[PDB]
Design a protein around this nucleic acid. Sequence first.
RNA 1: CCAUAGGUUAAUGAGGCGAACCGGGGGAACUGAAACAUCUAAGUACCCCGAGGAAAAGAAAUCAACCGAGAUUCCCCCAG
RNA 2: UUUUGUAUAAUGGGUCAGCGACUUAUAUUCUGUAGCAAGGUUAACCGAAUAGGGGAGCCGAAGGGAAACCGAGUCUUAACU
RNA 3: AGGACCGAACCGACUAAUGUUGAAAAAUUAGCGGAUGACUUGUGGCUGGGGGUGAAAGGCCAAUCAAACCGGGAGAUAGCUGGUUCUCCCCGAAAGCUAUUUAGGUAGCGCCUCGUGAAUUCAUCUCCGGGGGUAGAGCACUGUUUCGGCAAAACCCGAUGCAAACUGCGAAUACCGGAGAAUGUUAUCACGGGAGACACACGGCGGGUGCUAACGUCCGUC
RNA 4: GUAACGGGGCUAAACCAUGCACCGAAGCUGCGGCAGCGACGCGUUGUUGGGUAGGGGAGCGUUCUGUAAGCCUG
RNA 5: GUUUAUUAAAAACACAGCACUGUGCAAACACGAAAGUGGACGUAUACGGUGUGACGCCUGCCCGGUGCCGGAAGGUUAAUUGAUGGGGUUAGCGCAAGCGAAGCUCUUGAUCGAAGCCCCGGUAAACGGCGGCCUAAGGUAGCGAAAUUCCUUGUCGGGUAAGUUCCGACCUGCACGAAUGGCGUAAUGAUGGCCAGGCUGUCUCCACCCGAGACUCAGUGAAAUUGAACUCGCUGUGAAGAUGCAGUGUACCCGCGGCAAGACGGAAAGACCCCGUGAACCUUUACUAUAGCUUGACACUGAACAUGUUCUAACGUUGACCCGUAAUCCGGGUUGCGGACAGUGUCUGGUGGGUAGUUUGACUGGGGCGGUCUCCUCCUAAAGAGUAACGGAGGAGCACGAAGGUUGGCUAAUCCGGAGGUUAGUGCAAUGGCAUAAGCCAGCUUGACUGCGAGCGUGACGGCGCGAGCAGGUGCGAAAGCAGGUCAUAGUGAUCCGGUGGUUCUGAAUGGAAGGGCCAUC
RNA 6: CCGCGAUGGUAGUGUGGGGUCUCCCCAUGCGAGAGUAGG
Lengths: 48, 75, 64
Amino acid sequence: GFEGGQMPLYRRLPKFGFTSRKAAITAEIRLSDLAKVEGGVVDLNTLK
Amino acid sequence: RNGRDSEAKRLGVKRFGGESVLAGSIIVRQRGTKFHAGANVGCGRDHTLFAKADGKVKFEVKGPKNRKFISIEAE
Amino acid sequence: PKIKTVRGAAKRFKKTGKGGFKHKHANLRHILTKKATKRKRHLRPKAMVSKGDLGLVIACLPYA
RNA sequence: CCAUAGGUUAAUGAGGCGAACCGGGGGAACUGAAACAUCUAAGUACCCCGAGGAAAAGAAAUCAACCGAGAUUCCCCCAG
RNA sequence: UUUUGUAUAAUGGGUCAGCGACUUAUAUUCUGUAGCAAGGUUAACCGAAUAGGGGAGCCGAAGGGAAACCGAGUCUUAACU
RNA sequence: AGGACCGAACCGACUAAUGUUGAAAAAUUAGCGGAUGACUUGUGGCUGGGGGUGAAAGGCCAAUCAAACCGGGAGAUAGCUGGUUCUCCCCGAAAGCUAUUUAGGUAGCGCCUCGUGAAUUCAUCUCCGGGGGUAGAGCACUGUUUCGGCAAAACCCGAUGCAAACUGCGAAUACCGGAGAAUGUUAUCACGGGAGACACACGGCGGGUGCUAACGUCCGUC
RNA sequence: GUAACGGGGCUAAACCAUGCACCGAAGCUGCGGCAGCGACGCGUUGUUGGGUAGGGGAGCGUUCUGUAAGCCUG
RNA sequence: GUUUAUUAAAAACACAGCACUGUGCAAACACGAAAGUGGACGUAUACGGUGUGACGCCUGCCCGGUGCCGGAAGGUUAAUUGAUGGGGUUAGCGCAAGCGAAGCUCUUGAUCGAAGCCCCGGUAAACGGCGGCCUAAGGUAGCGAAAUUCCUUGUCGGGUAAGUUCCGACCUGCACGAAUGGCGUAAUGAUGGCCAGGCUGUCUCCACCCGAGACUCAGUGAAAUUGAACUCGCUGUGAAGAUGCAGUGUACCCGCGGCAAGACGGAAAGACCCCGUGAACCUUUACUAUAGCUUGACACUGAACAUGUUCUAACGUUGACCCGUAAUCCGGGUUGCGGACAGUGUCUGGUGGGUAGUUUGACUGGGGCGGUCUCCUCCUAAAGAGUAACGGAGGAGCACGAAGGUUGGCUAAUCCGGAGGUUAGUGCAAUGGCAUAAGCCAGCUUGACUGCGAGCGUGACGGCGCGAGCAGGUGCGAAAGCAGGUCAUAGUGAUCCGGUGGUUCUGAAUGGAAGGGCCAUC
RNA sequence: CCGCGAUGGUAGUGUGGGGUCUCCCCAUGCGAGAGUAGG
Ligand SMILES: [K+]
Ligand SMILES: [K+]
Ligand SMILES: [K+]
Ligand SMILES: [K+]
Ligand SMILES: [K+]
Ligand SMILES: [K+]
Ligand SMILES: [K+]
Ligand SMILES: [K+]
Ligand SMILES: [K+]
Ligand SMILES: [K+]
Ligand SMILES: [K+]
Ligand SMILES: [K+]
Ligand SMILES: [K+]
Ligand SMILES: [K+]
Ligand SMILES: [K+]
Ligand SMILES: [K+]
Ligand SMILES: [K+]
Ligand SMILES: [K+]
Ligand SMILES: [K+]
Ligand SMILES: [K+]
Ligand SMILES: [K+]
Ligand SMILES: [K+]
Ligand SMILES: [K+]
Ligand SMILES: [K+]
Ligand SMILES: [K+]
Ligand SMILES: [Mg+2]
Ligand SMILES: [Mg+2]
Ligand SMILES: [Mg+2]
Ligand SMILES: [Mg+2]
Ligand SMILES: [Mg+2]
Ligand SMILES: [Mg+2]
Ligand SMILES: [Mg+2]
Ligand SMILES: [Mg+2]
Ligand SMILES: [Mg+2]
Ligand SMILES: [Mg+2]
Ligand SMILES: [Mg+2]
Ligand SMILES: [Mg+2]
Ligand SMILES: [Mg+2]
Ligand SMILES: [Mg+2]
Ligand SMILES: [Mg+2]
Ligand SMILES: [Mg+2]
Ligand SMILES: [Mg+2]
Ligand SMILES: [Mg+2]
Ligand SMILES: [Mg+2]
Ligand SMILES: [Mg+2]
Ligand SMILES: [Mg+2]
Ligand SMILES: [Mg+2]
Ligand SMILES: [Mg+2]
Ligand SMILES: [Mg+2]
Ligand SMILES: [Mg+2]
Ligand SMILES: [Mg+2]
Ligand SMILES: [Mg+2]
Ligand SMILES: [Mg+2]
Ligand SMILES: [Mg+2]
Ligand SMILES: [Mg+2]
Ligand SMILES: [Mg+2]
Ligand SMILES: [Mg+2]
Ligand SMILES: [Mg+2]
Ligand SMILES: [Mg+2]
Ligand SMILES: [Mg+2]
Ligand SMILES: [Mg+2]
Ligand SMILES: [Mg+2]
Ligand SMILES: [Mg+2]
Ligand SMILES: [Mg+2]
Ligand SMILES: [Mg+2]
Ligand SMILES: [Mg+2]
Ligand SMILES: [Mg+2]
Ligand SMILES: [Mg+2]
Ligand SMILES: [Mg+2]
Ligand SMILES: [Mg+2]
Ligand SMILES: [Mg+2]
Ligand SMILES: [Mg+2]
Ligand SMILES: [Mg+2]
Ligand SMILES: [Mg+2]
Ligand SMILES: [Mg+2]
Ligand SMILES: [Mg+2]
Ligand SMILES: [Mg+2]
Ligand SMILES: [Mg+2]
Ligand SMILES: [Mg+2]
Ligand SMILES: [Mg+2]
Ligand SMILES: [Mg+2]
Ligand SMILES: [Mg+2]
Ligand SMILES: [Mg+2]
Ligand SMILES: [Mg+2]
Ligand SMILES: [Mg+2]
Ligand SMILES: [Mg+2]
Ligand SMILES: [Mg+2]
Ligand SMILES: [Mg+2]
Ligand SMILES: [Mg+2]
Ligand SMILES: [Mg+2]
Ligand SMILES: [Mg+2]
Ligand SMILES: [Mg+2]
Ligand SMILES: [Mg+2]
Ligand SMILES: [Mg+2]
Ligand SMILES: [Mg+2]
Ligand SMILES: [Mg+2]
Ligand SMILES: [Mg+2]
Ligand SMILES: [Mg+2]
Ligand SMILES: [Mg+2]
Ligand SMILES: [Mg+2]
Ligand SMILES: [Mg+2]
Ligand SMILES: [Mg+2]
Ligand SMILES: [Mg+2]
Ligand SMILES: [Mg+2]
Ligand SMILES: [Mg+2]
Ligand SMILES: [Mg+2]
Ligand SMILES: [Mg+2]
Ligand SMILES: [Mg+2]
Ligand SMILES: [Mg+2]
Ligand SMILES: [Mg+2]
Ligand SMILES: [Mg+2]
Ligand SMILES: [Mg+2]
């Protein structure tokens, strides 16, 4: 990231946003995953 | 006591006669109306002439003052 | 050992679907009264990192 | 004044050495930051004390998240 | 060797023999190649086992948004031509 | 009597020559100063490194002193200098721009290379459409200039020149776009792997600077 | 130290004009050979091959491990 | 006397003498985290520090600056203390919106508060200063072309045939001057300058001689250096001063004694000079710290009223005596003195080159000094864009709720109603524009709107610019239409950190909150 | 729609070549401005 002493790109641009703790404990399930569970009922525990 | 100058402004003609342009395209950047806006050409706040329609650039000398107008001939 | 992320870069860039990076525009922190609304409006949405700069950003964010 | 300090003798133990590892008492700077002081190097090097075949830690005033786990230690993940 | 440029009166070497400088570890990306393929691969460890077990994990199959969230869309905006 | 006098031992070190791979990492020779004193010398002791000691020269502290020596941190760091080892084949730069406590460093871009993909993509010429304000020219303008006339020597008129920052004119070339053929190993553009380079030199042409001085200096272009 | 034709020398062996000859390079051509790239007949044709930094491609040789209780060697 | 052992012996250091200043003894001061020790088994006729430097005659004026000393009314001011207000949470109260006790909690910071500083004085043998109307005061005595005088070899006198030196004067002191002493001064000096007698191979100008080398023979036997050498002159050429290139001249092969013009000879990775975001040590009113010194609060730390002192019991004792004991340590005891002081710990303000770590820009016809550094206009700039120099010329770091928007109306300079036609005007440089006026006036106004934005320009990038049109809502005008600031091009500052307002976001068990995000803004 | 102008010569200049090289010349291509006849 050193540019010869010019204020580098990752410092001349502003920070933004925050990180969500909820996003880390949220998943997406594809339709192709629904058959992969045992016994035809899809909930968190059967997906796990 | 000298040694100063300003940045060059890249003025002048961007699209010459007969060039096909899209609407919005800048035709000339200038200081004041060295060229004037003809048919299908707008004049911006800094005297930039730009195409208001798709077509070909046309320079022409018209009026009693014999002024250089720029128009777009629609395709 | 594992490469360390440049943590300042991770706070300023996010990787997009085709592997580019989005960033927030400069010039919208302060000294805002003198700036035209048009100029500020155009600085609000996030922008993509340019081709010249991608190499620098990628080096800083090896786990992007 | 009683006494206590002190004195003499006896018994028992210690003392010193040793490469690393271990716990503790102290603790740099070069260096990096393209200068430099916060910061880094690093609780590293080094000095000191003490131990053992290992040491230290250890049996929840611990986590968790409304479900539960169940002392300490070490390894792989979690994750740059 | 260094230089715009060296027979240079710039540098280095008296000669010979021997030694003398892009490595190693881990991470990461790209190329080649091999395996398997919407999957791929296991770590520690167990195992007398280069086997076999171990799928904890990791990467991929979905993105958009600061985020809640929505989702082949999503964000922007009261709302998009 | 005396930090008294002359002068050996003893202690010094003012001058000169020699010596300078020495007889000697400080001496020899001839002269020189002190020589009862703040003298000199033997033996032993004490002061330790940002510390000592110093009638003070940054002097001396083991041939070492503006911070001893030895070991360690330690392979400190070194944008600097040097050096970098067998062979053949293909391609082949740059010494520029921008930014930089930057200027002999470095970063992005330009230029090299390798890979992948893609258009009649690119170049030359011809024809067509364009904008120019340079060369030249000119003097209405903005300044400058001379002569004559006229006349409040103004102004005005005729005649004559001059201009990077003058233009009532204005090329060649160059550049942008369009069309067409021929030619060219895609010569083009994009994306990705790997760079190097960012001290340039002279010569021609157009110029600034300098003295139309410099093998001078600074641009443009070949 | 001649020292302001490279020298000898030159009255052309100087200069101007016109012309035809010749010499002259690693240029071009001829003959033989090697290699890169472009189409494939796995045919031969077109063309290319000066190179520093540097990129790409392909190799030689050295020590050591397997192949090797093999093979060579008094 | 002393000194740079090893290029400086001196005018340097020291010195007796002088002065200032500190110091009452457990002295100041120094070494030491401390105990202690030196000072000193001394006691102000003593001891430390500082400057000056025998002696003689002397030592002037300035206290404004910096220091030191004294003051202590007033201003300012630390820790500490926590008045007051504001917020979070929730028992309740409310049908809901919300409100909201106690407690806990986040924040605010009244009052208290020492030294210091400001302030008022003093002080120059403190650091220092000592004029051409001005100052704190304007240099006295003495001395002066000087260890000081640039101009300068000043000028005059002396000495010499001739004297930039010397001696004596003059004063025009570039830039003397009174204890960082002034002026003198007998004696002293391996001290600096000048002159004379004697003396001479110092010299005119060298000659001869005696010895040690050098030379030859025998024995022993180094060294630095060295790409390779078949290692000439000259004139040219050329990384610009040639044995090696060109042309030409000269030259049989090889030693020995000699000489040093060249081999840019040998020696030492130039010490000068510049450069490196190198080093060291030194300085200071550079920055940041910090030992030390100093201030107060709380602790060790107590008792009687005063809003004064007294007391003893903590504590001190480097007073005396006794014992452990053969002991100037130490401890215990007795006693005197001092006494809640002193002193030490934690906290805290001041002071703090005593000590430490560091910083102290770049460009540049070498560096420094000066100038410059961002932005705008013109020219250089070669008729697209761009284009350098410590090239040539000027500007900006704003202004304006009208000087913006729109509709209607209007047209200048200058000269003498007319002529003239922008030669004026533009909010401000310059260039290109502007009559359909962009110049100028009036009425009505807030489009100097919010969300967006086809497309394009310009940048390595960060960015910057131009923009029809779409949605919402608006102004002007009759309407067409125009309006997303201003004739255009300068009037500017990334990111971080934080502040303020808003907010269908987040909220570390849960509800909240804090903090964070997002939007606006500083 | 927006109030002059030939012909000829001259100046300049792209490309190639040359000289006595601060400036020119030759071959070839392009060819003004001003002015003249005239309108
Ligand atoms: K355009
Ligand atoms: K440090
Ligand atoms: K550095
Ligand atoms: K050089
Ligand atoms: K040299
Ligand atoms: K790799
Ligand atoms: K692979
Ligand atoms: K969309
Ligand atoms: K030291
Ligand atoms: K670069
Ligand atoms: K590339
Ligand atoms: K050139
Ligand atoms: K002496
Ligand atoms: K004072
Ligand atoms: K409350
Ligand atoms: K003087
Ligand atoms: K003094
Ligand atoms: K005196
Ligand atoms: K020769
Ligand atoms: K010689
Ligand atoms: K007592
Ligand atoms: K007390
Ligand atoms: K220069
Ligand atoms: K120079
Ligand atoms: K609208
Ligand atoms: Mg420029
Ligand atoms: Mg300009
Ligand atoms: Mg903001
Ligand atoms: Mg550093
Ligand atoms: Mg044991
Ligand atoms: Mg244990
Ligand atoms: Mg439970
Ligand atoms: Mg050179
Ligand atoms: Mg050569
Ligand atoms: Mg030589
Ligand atoms: Mg050489
Ligand atoms: Mg060198
Ligand atoms: Mg050498
Ligand atoms: Mg997703
Ligand atoms: Mg004597
Ligand atoms: Mg001595
Ligand atoms: Mg002697
Ligand atoms: Mg004597
Ligand atoms: Mg004597
Ligand atoms: Mg000195
Ligand atoms: Mg020594
Ligand atoms: Mg040191
Ligand atoms: Mg280290
Ligand atoms: Mg090293
Ligand atoms: Mg080639
Ligand atoms: Mg810039
Ligand atoms: Mg001209
Ligand atoms: Mg001109
Ligand atoms: Mg074309
Ligand atoms: Mg550079
Ligand atoms: Mg350069
Ligand atoms: Mg240069
Ligand atoms: Mg150049
Ligand atoms: Mg030239
Ligand atoms: Mg040159
Ligand atoms: Mg020249
Ligand atoms: Mg001669
Ligand atoms: Mg031939
Ligand atoms: Mg050939
Ligand atoms: Mg052939
Ligand atoms: Mg060839
Ligand atoms: Mg080749
Ligand atoms: Mg083998
Ligand atoms: Mg003496
Ligand atoms: Mg000496
Ligand atoms: Mg001496
Ligand atoms: Mg004492
Ligand atoms: Mg003195
Ligand atoms: Mg006070
Ligand atoms: Mg006084
Ligand atoms: Mg007087
Ligand atoms: Mg003089
Ligand atoms: Mg004189
Ligand atoms: Mg005289
Ligand atoms: Mg004489
Ligand atoms: Mg003399
Ligand atoms: Mg005199
Ligand atoms: Mg003096
Ligand atoms: Mg003085
Ligand atoms: Mg005085
Ligand atoms: Mg004085
Ligand atoms: Mg004196
Ligand atoms: Mg005197
Ligand atoms: Mg011999
Ligand atoms: Mg020569
Ligand atoms: Mg000889
Ligand atoms: Mg000799
Ligand atoms: Mg030499
Ligand atoms: Mg050197
Ligand atoms: Mg106290
Ligand atoms: Mg200090
Ligand atoms: Mg210091
Ligand atoms: Mg440091
Ligand atoms: Mg430094
Ligand atoms: Mg510099
Ligand atoms: Mg241009
Ligand atoms: Mg041009
Ligand atoms: Mg250029
Ligand atoms: Mg340039
Ligand atoms: Mg410039
Ligand atoms: Mg778009
Ligand atoms: Mg901060
Ligand atoms: Mg919570
Ligand atoms: Mg919680
Ligand atoms: Mg908030
Ligand atoms: Mg003609
Ligand atoms: Mg004409």
